[PDB]
Design a protein around this nucleic acid. Structure first.
Ligand code: NA
Ligand code: ZN
Ligand code: ZN
Ligand code: ZN
Ligand code: ZN
Lengths: 70, 67
DNA sequence: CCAGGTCAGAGTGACCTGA
DNA sequence: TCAGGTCACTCTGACCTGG
């Protein structure tokens, strides 16, 4: 377990996955996306923060891409 | 026949004091047995988008009078 | 060490069941 | 009629294994 944080949601990172530090959740979520159509119910600017229980599927995927997952 | 006052899907009956669909019925059922909005507490709740933000779906349930 | 797979855990909603 | 239960379906993510 690395002393690093997930660049997507701020949870503890499990490792360096798809080119970014990420948790198992965000790793699998991105994994499943490369194999989807999400719609943000708000304005495409949702906070992704695991500790505060904030997430949005569309904005989660956009943030995965934003921070550099490939 | 009436529409669900929470999401606009077809209503199945009068549940918890509100005309509503089986989805919103069950969702409120589970809530009364905690949700945070990642946006601005104004997320769209409709038959397409209702599953997306739990916090706003519950607030919409309360707004239209589910008890 | 990580990519990709696995499947128990959890939310959904159409349908069930008793008051 | 409705309140509350059911459970197949599906997404989630903790853990595994091979590389
Ligand atoms: Na997914
Ligand atoms: Zn994460
Ligand atoms: Zn969003
Ligand atoms: Zn509804
Ligand atoms: Zn919301």
């Amino acid at each position: 377990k690395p002393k690093r944080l997930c660049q997507v949601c701020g949870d503890h990172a499990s490792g360096f996955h798809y080119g970014v530090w990420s948790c198992e959740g965000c790793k699998a979520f991105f994994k499943r996306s490369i194999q989807v159509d999400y719609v943000c119910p708000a304005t495409n600017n949702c906070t992704i923060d695991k500790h505060r229980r904030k997430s949005c599927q569309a904005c989660r995927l956009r943030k995965c891409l934003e921070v550099g997952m490939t």
